[PDB]
Design a protein around this nucleic acid. Structure first.
Length: 288
DNA sequence: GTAGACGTGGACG
DNA sequence: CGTCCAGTCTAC
């Protein structure tokens, strides 16, 4: 999941678990049933702990916890979702981690491919440096300076898929959709964009992230769609208002765009076994 | 730059 | 059966 899904997920985890007391976390299968996550033993030795919040930056999610009788000593759960990571209020297929709160309340993290990660830490300093490895959150920051794009002689699709250079939160489908709406060829070097292209790109980045955030059935978050429609949405990018009510794929994994224009499934970014497919429509997206 | 890896599928032929 | 597609790390 990308920025929008991770953020909505954290909103839901906060609604249900902020102020609750975590009593145990069990890794019942997957990678962490075979090997302990970093810091697990030390964290477990300090349970139970009260959840003070759940927050996100880009695709990175974390819990903040503390003991009411020593409110200064804070604990953190670091979480990345990878490709198939998903939280839920019920024990779904591929459940890897089970969080047990007071009064039989439960949270479950599921992950088919096991690419998601957990780390436990007692260091606010370590988290701060971690957050500093990520660019500003595309969804939650309303004034990122997108003109930094022009300094890089690299394909705009790679610059946007990077989590540090311009901003964090965008992934394979957001980028493709954004570049289609902005009418920009994915190959175009950031250093070749005009100031108008940049302004237009920033408009559409906000438009798409907000649209995805606001959606109730994006796909991945099936395990929370009951909760998604029962919770509100924070007023990110307040001045931008998508017309559609659900996020729709215009080019991603499509053979044609909505107007019948051919969609190319291009392999621009990556090498070896990390190559990604960039969907774009040449008829619409050009170098101008 | 290039290459590989991390489990587990779904869709399709 | 088979093939291809589906966030981020690491090394030469």
């Amino acid at each position: 999941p990308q920025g929008p899904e991770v953020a909505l997920t954290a909103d839901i985890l906060e609604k249900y678990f902020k102020g609750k007391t975590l009593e145990y976390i069990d890794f019942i299968s997957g990678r962490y049933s075979k090997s302990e996550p970093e810091g697990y033993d030390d964290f477990i030795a300090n349970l139970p702990l009260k959840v003070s919040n759940v927050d996100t930056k880009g695709k990175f999610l974390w819990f903040e916890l503390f003991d009411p009788n020593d409110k200064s000593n804070k604990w953190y759960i670091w979480n990345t979702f990878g490709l198939t990571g998903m939280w839920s209020l019920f024990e779904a297929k591929y459940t890897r981690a089970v969080l047990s709160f007071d009064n039989e309340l439960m949270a479950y993290f599921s992950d088919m491919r096991n690419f998601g990660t957990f780390k436990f830490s007692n260091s606010e300093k370590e988290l701060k440096r971690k957050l500093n490895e990520l660019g500003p959150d595309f969804l939650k920051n309303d004034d990122i300076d997108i003109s930094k794009i022009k300094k890089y002689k690299q394909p705009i699709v790679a610059l946007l898929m990077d989590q540090k250079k311009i901003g964090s939160g965008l992934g394979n489908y957001l980028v493709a959709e954004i570049l289609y709406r902005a009418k920009i060829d994915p190959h175009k070097l950031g250093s070749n964009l005009t100031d108008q292209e940049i302004e237009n790109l920033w408009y559409w980045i906000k438009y798409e992230t907000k649209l995805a955030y606001d959606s109730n059935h994006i796909g991945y978050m099936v395990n929370l769609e009951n909760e998604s429609s029962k919770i509100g949405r924070k007023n990110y990018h307040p001045n931008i208002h998508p017309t559609e009510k659900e996020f729709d794929f215009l080019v991603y994994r499509k053979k044609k765009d909505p107007n019948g224009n051919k969609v190319i499934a291009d392999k621009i970014i990556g090498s070896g076994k990390n190559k990604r497919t960039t969907y774009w429509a040449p008829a619409i997206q050009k170098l101008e």
